[PDB]
Amino acid sequence: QSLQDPWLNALRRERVPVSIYLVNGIKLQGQIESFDQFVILLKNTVSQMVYKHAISTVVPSR
Amino acid sequence: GQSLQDPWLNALRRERVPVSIYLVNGIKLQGQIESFDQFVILLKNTVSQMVYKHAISTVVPSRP
Amino acid sequence: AKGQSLQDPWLNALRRERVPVSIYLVNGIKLQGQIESFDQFVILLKNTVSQMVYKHAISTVVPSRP
Amino acid sequence: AKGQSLQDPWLNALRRERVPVSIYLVNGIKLQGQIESFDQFVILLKNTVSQMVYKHAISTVVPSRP
Amino acid sequence: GQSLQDPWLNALRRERVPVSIYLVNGIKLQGQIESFDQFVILLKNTVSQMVYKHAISTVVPSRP
Amino acid sequence: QSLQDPWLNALRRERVPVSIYLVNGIKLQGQIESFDQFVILLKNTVSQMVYKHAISTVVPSR
């Protein structure tokens, strides 16, 4: 909410590359294209919709 | 009511884009989005199956 | 679509029509039977016995017939 | 600059950031909404509905915020 | 690749010359050329707006 | 192409005054300073760049 939205918003605006670790161990990398309450759209060579319930952590590269 | 998910899935449905749905358990389903609501997605391939969103990790369209 | 507008009519059709289904759980177990009843959170699945399945444990429901 | 090096990143930034824009048409009509998507020739503009606007009909795009 | 337009606009941009952009519909915009590409000009005044070249009739710099 | 370029080139070289009528009805007058594929630079009391897509006709004075 008061932390999650502004944090992702600044990453999207600044085009900061991120790593998204899923609860199952898979690591995704890309730019945050957009997001809403339940999903984050991540763009690398492809554009994919990631459900937040499957994410463990989002780690910015810088 | 803010949604990115709703119009993104609706576009995929309307334009009948093939997608891959990766489940949290690592299983990959493929097909077209026939319909969806708040909690489920109806995926159509050789058969029509209902997938619970809570079981989904990622949806990858074969074109955006 | 919005809300339960897909899940409820889809499960209700299977229930009324007694279509055999396979219910795949997130852990990979496959359950089979007919949908006897359901509510917001559970599905009652009838095979040799009637068992209550929590929807949160389900990944996919695959009907044996369209 | 050359090619689409200005138009594409500028529209993409507005799209990703869901910045409300005004789109002034060559005939003087003002359209408003958020850029949902765009390609070479059209912009999909979302307000109460999603409408496809041909770029050839547009004179200026004015963002509501920088 | 022959261009008069590219270096002329680039000079105006680099030297931050105020220009008037007259549109084909008779509307006059004013500001400085912030940037441009093949099809658009970004004009800066109180706000920064993208103008499509196809809508422009003439660009008049307040000095050449 | 084979007509437009040599015609404008001779007007520029000979310093022939021209009238440029725009599709919207406005008449501009001056000397052709230069031109390329998409624009003509017209000089009178000011130097202005005119997009060819906005021009209907170019009429030489002599």
From Swiss-Prot, chains A, F:
The keyword Metal-binding does not apply. Disruption phenotype: Deletion of hfq seems to lead to a significant translational fidelity problem. Deletion increases persister cell formation. Deletion abolishes the antitoxin activity of sRNA antitoxin RalA, preventing it from neutralizing toxin RalR. Changing residue 15 to A: Almost completely disrupts the ability of Hfq to form condensates in both growing and late stationary phases. The keyword DNA-binding applies. One of its GO terms (biological process) is regulation of DNA-templated transcription. Changing residue 27 to A: Almost completely disrupts the ability of Hfq to form condensates in both growing and late stationary phases. GO terms for cellular component: bacterial nucleoid; cytosol. One of its GO terms (molecular function) is DNA binding. Forms condensates in vivo, both in the absence and presence of stress, which differ in their material state. Hfq condensation has no impact on transcription but seems important for the roles of Hfq as an mRNA chaperone at the post-transcriptional level. Hfq condensation also appears important for its role as an sRNA stabilizer. It is found in: Cytoplasm. Homohexamer. Interacts with H-NS. RNA chaperone that binds small regulatory RNA (sRNAs) and mRNAs to facilitate mRNA translational regulation in response to envelope stress, environmental stress and changes in metabolite concentrations. Involved in the regulation of stress responses mediated by the sigma factors RpoS, sigma-E and sigma-32. Binds with high specificity to tRNAs. Binds sRNA antitoxin RalA. In vitro, stimulates synthesis of long tails by poly(A) polymerase I. Required for RNA phage Qbeta replication. This is RNA-binding protein Hfq. It comes from Escherichia coli (strain K12). The gene is hfq. The chain holds residues 5 to 66 of 102 of the full protein.
